[PDB]
Amino acid sequence: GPVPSRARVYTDVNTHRPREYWDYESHVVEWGNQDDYQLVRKLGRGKYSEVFEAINITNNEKVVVKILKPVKKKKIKREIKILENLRGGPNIITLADIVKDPVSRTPALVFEHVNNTDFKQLYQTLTDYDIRFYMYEILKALDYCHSMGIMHRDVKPHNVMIDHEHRKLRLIDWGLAEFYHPGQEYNVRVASRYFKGPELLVDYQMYDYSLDMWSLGCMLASMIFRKEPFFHGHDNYDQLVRIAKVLGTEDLYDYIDKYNIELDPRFNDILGRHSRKRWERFVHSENQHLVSPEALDFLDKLLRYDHQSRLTAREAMEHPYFYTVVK
Ligand SMILES: C#Cc1cccc(Nc2nc3cc(C(=O)O)ccc3c3cncnc23)c1
């Protein structure tokens, strides 16, 4: 079968935590008072919930309320336990309360409110400095959650809320996050298409924190090159082909061969042969001010087929790309 894999860092975090920490199915939710919060306006809904701006009438503060759809009850305590485990961590959104909504008959998560500028608008204006600065803030959040034995699995621009005024960043929507246990096989149906790691795309289930680092690399490439999303596939198969047109097919084969993985035969007549490209090819007069040798080398070290070969969050923070960011 497949060759097994282990995270190269934080491998045994959960192994030596108490069972209460990671056994989320045993978690007992501490309920707050649903009457404390008044819905103000609907912000949107995903496949799993509806999110509302609201006011906390005990202090008149703005908050956000995420009313979970009655689907996949297991996921509910997973997301709750992960938020409580990570609460107070750098740049991790704060879960302020949990209440039972009387209409949906489901849990409603109450989060801190972030006065953000949507990425579709924000990304048009980021400077070279802004991108390094915010990348560094994202890494703080990822090193934190990885060091706490959790992978996010849904890193994408929408989940990185940024108040550009106060230069405040929060990593949100831990609804796809999971505990990392060495040797555990996970569902590959996670992340948004454009940010799915090659591991998910070739059906390799024994992945780990390094998945987030691929997603981060996709974000970075979209920011420095001003092309969002960068790998813009039409479906999960074309997504891998798009990647292979940049990283090349030989290193893809090396990857699947290392883990003795077999490509879906559907790729037989769509994958072709492709050389690995140099990142400079994506540079032009409209994004060159965002690009530097340090940026390209950092990106290159994030976007690797082999999950074991990508920079960890901690290593990424040590990269020359961030020397110019004020600490
Ligand atoms: C569905 C939807 C939808 C569509 C557009 C905008 C938003 N806005 C916000 N979503 C959040 C989600 C979470 C979470 O899921 O952990 C935490 C905090 C926020 C948040 C905080 N502050 C301001 N806005 C949001 C949501």
Q: Which of 16, 116, 20, 109 is nearest to 68 (CA)?
A: 109
Residue 279: count of CB within 10 angstroms of its CB? 18
Note the residue count of the chain.
Answer: 327
Q: Are residues 219 and 235 in the same domain?
A: yes
How many angstroms separate the CA atoms of 50 and 43, rounded? 8
Q: Do the bridges between strand 160-163 and strand 61-68 make them parallel or antiparallel, or are there none, so unpaired?
A: unpaired
Q: Does residue 321 contact residue 239 with C-beta atoms inside 8 Å?
A: no
Residue minimizing CA distance to atom 8 of ligand 1: 43
Task: Give the total number of structural domains in the chain.
Answer: 2
Q: Are residues 271 and 190 in the same domain?
A: yes
Q: Does residue 243 contact residue 216 with C-beta atoms inside 8 Å?
A: no
- The gap between the terminal CA atoms of the chain, to the nearest Å, is 47
How many angstroms separate the CA atoms of 172 and 174, rounded? 6
Q: How far is the CA of 2 from the centre of ligand 1 (A)?
A: 38
Q: Cβ(66) to ligand 1 under 6 A?
A: yes
How many angstroms separate the CA atoms of 70 and 12, rounded? 33
Backbone angles phi, psi at 214, to 5 degrees: -65, -50
Q: Are residues 106 and 167 in the same domain?
A: no
Q: Are residues 90 and 137 in the same domain?
A: no
Q: Annotation-wise, does 280 bind a ligand? A: no
Q: Are residues 123 and 190 in the same domain?
A: yes
User: Considering Cα of 118, then 123, then 128, then 133, what sign does the dihedral take?
Assistant: positive
Instruction: Find the catalytic residue in 97, 143, 154, 173.
Output: 154
Residue minimizing CA distance to atom 21 of ligand 1: 113
Q: Are residues 76 and 218 in the same domain?
A: no
Q: Are residues 290 and 226 in the same domain?
A: yes
Quote the tokens at residue 127: 């400077």
Q: Annotation-wise, does 233 bind a ligand? A: no
Domain stops at, among 113, 135, 162: 113
Q: Which atom of ligand 1 is nearest to the CA of 49?
A: 1
Quote the tokens at residue 85: 């485990």
Domain stops at, among 90, 113, 136: 113
Residue burial 137-146, b: 16+ Cβ < 10 Å; e: rest: bbbbbbbbbb
Q: Are residues 136 and 256 in the same domain?
A: yes
Q: Annotation-wise, does 62 bind a ligand? A: no
Helix axes 249-258, 236-247, angle to 10 degrees: 110
Q: Which atom of ligand 1 is nearest to the CA of 116?
A: 23
Name every residue whose Cβ is closer than 8 Å to that of residue 136 and which is 6 or more positions away in sequence.
317, 322, 325
How many angstroms separate the CA atoms of 139 and 113, rounded? 21
Q: Are residues 61 and 198 in the same domain?
A: no
Q: Does residue 180 contact residue 13 with C-beta atoms inside 8 Å?
A: yes
Matching residue, tokens 């097994």: 4
This structure's resolution (angstroms)?
1.9
Q: Which of 66, 69, 71 is nearest to 99 (CA)?
A: 66
Q: Does residue 128 contact residue 309 with C-beta atoms inside 8 Å?
A: no
Q: Are residues 207 and 139 in the same domain?
A: yes
Q: Cβ(172) to ligand 1 under 6 A?
A: yes
Q: Annotation-wise, does 48 bind a ligand? A: yes
Q: Cβ(62) to ligand 1 under 6 A?
A: no
Q: Respond yes or no: is residue 118 known to be catalytic.
A: no
DSSP alpha helix (H) spans, 16-127: 19-22, 73-86, 119-122
DSSP 256-285: HHHTT----GGGGGT----PPPPGGGG--T
Q: Do the bridges between strand 107-112 and strand 61-68 make them parallel or antiparallel, or are there none, so unpaired?
A: antiparallel
Q: Annotation-wise, does 185 bind a ligand? A: no
CA–CA distances in Å: residue 231 to residues 126, 272, 303: 20, 17, 11
3-state SS of the chain? CCCCCCCCCCCCCHHHCCHHHHCHHHCCCCCCCHHHEEEEEEEEECCCEEEEEEEECCCCEEEEEEEECCCCHHHHHHHHHHHHHHCCCCCECCEEEEEECCCCCCEEEEEECCCCCCHHHHCCCCCHHHHHHHHHHHHHHHHHHHHCCEECCCCCHHHEEEECCCCEEEECCHHHCEECCCCCCCCCCCCCHHHCCHHHHCCCCCCCCHHHHHHHHHHHHHHHCCCCCCCCCCCHHHHHHHHHHHHCHHHHHHHHHHCCCCCCHHHHHCCCCCCCCCHHHHCCCCCHHHCCHHHHHHHHHHCCCCHHHCCCHHHHHCCHHHCCCCC
DSSP 61-84: EEEEEEEE-S--HHHHHHHHHHHH
Q: How far is the CA of 215 from the centre of ligand 1 (A)?
A: 19
Q: Are residues 148 and 292 in the same domain?
A: yes
Residue 295: count of CB within 10 angstroms of its CB? 24
Q: How far is the CA of 161 from the centre of ligand 1 (A)?
A: 8
Domain stops at, among 113, 134, 159: 113
For residue 88, the domain's CATH number is: 3.30.200.20
Quote the tokens at residue 197: 């790691």
Q: Cβ(51) to ligand 1 under 6 A?
A: yes
Quote the tokens at residue 66: 């995420």
Q: Does residue 51 contact residue 66 with C-beta atoms inside 8 Å?
A: yes
How many angstroms separate the CA atoms of 61 and 53, rounded? 11
Q: Which of 277, 326, 325 is nearest to 303 (CA)?
A: 277
Q: How far is the CA of 86 from the centre of ligand 1 (A)?
A: 17
Residue 70, preceding peptide bond in cis (omega within 30° of 0): no
For residue 220, the domain's CATH number is: 1.10.510.10
Q: Which domain holds residue 84?
A: 23-113
Q: Are residues 36 and 17 in the same domain?
A: no
Amino acid code (one letter) for 273: R
Q: How far is the CA of 174 from the centre of ligand 1 (A)?
A: 11
Amino acid code (one letter) for 111: F
Residue minimizing CA distance to atom 15 of ligand 1: 173
Q: How many Cα atoms sit within 13 Å of 163 on the Cβ side?
A: 11
* 3-class SS of residue 7: coil
CA–CA distances in Å: residue 269 to residues 212, 261, 272, 327: 30, 18, 7, 50
Q: Does residue 316 contact residue 302 with C-beta atoms inside 8 Å?
A: yes
Amino acid code (one letter) for 44: G
How many angstroms separate the CA atoms of 39 and 28, rounded? 26
